[PDB]
């Protein structure tokens, strides 16, 4: 049960620096070479860096060599990526990656497997401002009832950069949830809705709370969604 959890994604002004972290669990961290890989439309999936199990050797992709630094702190089960001199084209989701197989624990065998991935952390490089979302209820009513189904949701409006996450009732409600892709408004701010479908008969008996997290602005909002009597 090897697990990787990346942190640190944020909006960065062009030319500035950002450090990402990766917390490793469920495996003996010091026994594994560790990598960073990113994903964007411009780059596709692009390997960036590796550090050996013993920390002595590091290798880097041409695109980031001389700007990005990989390091590890085994006592903290943590991998780092120091990103300097950031550029628009560095805008991407950044993943921590390792492998289950460390049979041949040296170059180039730690490039063969790449089968343990984190959840990713989003880095945006732009001349723009961080803005936390406003969260508004999409109140259920007869107008959001269709046969045996009712819908309710939360509107997560006017934030920058991506991304936001939405849970419902702290994860007790997962069935019928659709969190829509964000759309960029004419203002240059993102907006999305998260909706959940419930039995039509359930309206007026249940408490619905959307849990919104905008890590780049360090914003968290719990918004209660109550029916409109119409």
């Amino acid at each position: 049960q090897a697990q990787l959890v990346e942190s640190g994604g944020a909006l960065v002004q062009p030319g500035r620096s950002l450090r990402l972290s990766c917390a490793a669990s469920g495996f003996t961290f010091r026994n594994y070479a560790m990598h960073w890989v990113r994903q964007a439309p411009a780059t596709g999936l692009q390997w960036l860096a590796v550090i050996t199990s013993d920390g002595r050797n590091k290798f880097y992709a041409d695109s980031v060599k001389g700007r990005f630094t990989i390091s590890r702190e085994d006592s903290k089960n943590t991998l780092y990526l120091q990103m300097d001199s950031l550029r628009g084209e560095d805008t991407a989701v950044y993943y921590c990656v390792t492998q289950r197989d460390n049979s041949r624990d040296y170059f180039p065998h730690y490039f063969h497997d790449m089968d343990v991935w984190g959840q990713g952390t989003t880095v945006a490089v732009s001349s723009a401002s961080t803005k936390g979302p406003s969260v508004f209820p999409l109140a259920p009513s007869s107008k959001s009832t269709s046969g045996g189904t009712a819908a309710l949701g939360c509107l997560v409006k006017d934030y920058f950069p991506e991304p936001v996450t939405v849970s419902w009732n702290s994860g007790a409600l997962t069935s019928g949830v659709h969190t829509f892709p964000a759309v960029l408004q004419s203002s240059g701010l993102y907006s999305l809705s998260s909706v959940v479908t419930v039995p039509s008969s359930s309206l007026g008996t249940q408490t619905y709370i959307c849990n919104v997290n905008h890590k780049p602005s360090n914003t968290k909002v719990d918004k209660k969604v109550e029916p409109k009597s119409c």
Binding site: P108, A150, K157, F180, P181, S191, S193
Partner: protein, 219 residues
């Protein structure tokens, strides 16, 4: 670096039918140990890639038997014997033979399923949003197929243009449907000048256009 070219880039497949994805490499992927480090990955939206196949043809633990890999040298194939709903997503080949490890551009597997009419829902703006001077009206089309749908906003029977935005989900991994949001944005002033807010939906699965509407102040 080694360039991997996938074909096709979009792969519509009928539920239960076979799928084949090609990966071609700029150079032989045979490494100096005589082994070929060509892997296939499975990525769902907002999810990380998940390895399915390693060293051309070896299935990872827990990977369904319907996934198989073949090929040699510069030409490789991922085959899905019978596509299931949970197979929707983007598939990537990856080579680790000649560092740096590189990935193909991704092939998006789209499921062709039976026609499903959307359920249509409308949401008035919140009092909280109106206090900030803006009104967002949201129309939801839930769990429909195919993706093609027309949403028109009417305010007091006035067809709106250029004041709404749509978002469509990726195909659902259980029922192979899409959902669509349409958001109409008005000033508080324009919102409170009109009574009837209506979402009109056209879809193959609907026998006639469906309207969901509310009267401001009733809701």
């Amino acid at each position: 670096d080694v360039v991997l070219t996938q074909s096709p880039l979009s792969l519509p497949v009928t539920l239960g039918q076979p799928a084949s994805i090609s990966c071609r490499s700029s150079q032989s992927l045979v490494y100096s140990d005589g082994d070929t480090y060509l892997n296939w990955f499975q990525q769902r939206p907002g999810q990380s890639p998940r390895r399915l196949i390693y060293q051309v043809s070896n299935r990872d633990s827990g990977v369904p038997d319907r996934f198989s890999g073949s090929g040699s040298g510069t030409d490789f194939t991922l085959k899905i014997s019978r596509v299931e709903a949970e197979d929707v997503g983007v598939y990537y080949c990856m080579q680790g033979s000649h560092w740096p490890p590189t990935f193909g551009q991704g092939t998006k597997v789209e499921i062709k399923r039976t026609v499903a009419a959307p359920s249509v829902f409308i949401f008035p703006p919140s009092d909280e949003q109106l206090k900030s001077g803006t009104a967002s009206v949201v129309c939801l089309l839930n769990n429909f197929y195919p993706r093609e749908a027309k949403v028109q906003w009417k305010v007091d029977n006035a067809l709106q243009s250029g004041n709404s935005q749509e978002s469509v989900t990726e195909q659902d991994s259980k029922d192979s449907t899409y959902s669509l949001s349409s958001t109409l944005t008005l000033s508080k002033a324009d919102y409170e000048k009109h009574k009837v807010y209506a979402c009109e939906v056209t879809h193959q699965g609907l026998s006639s256009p469906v309207t969901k509407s509310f009267n401001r102040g009733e809701c």
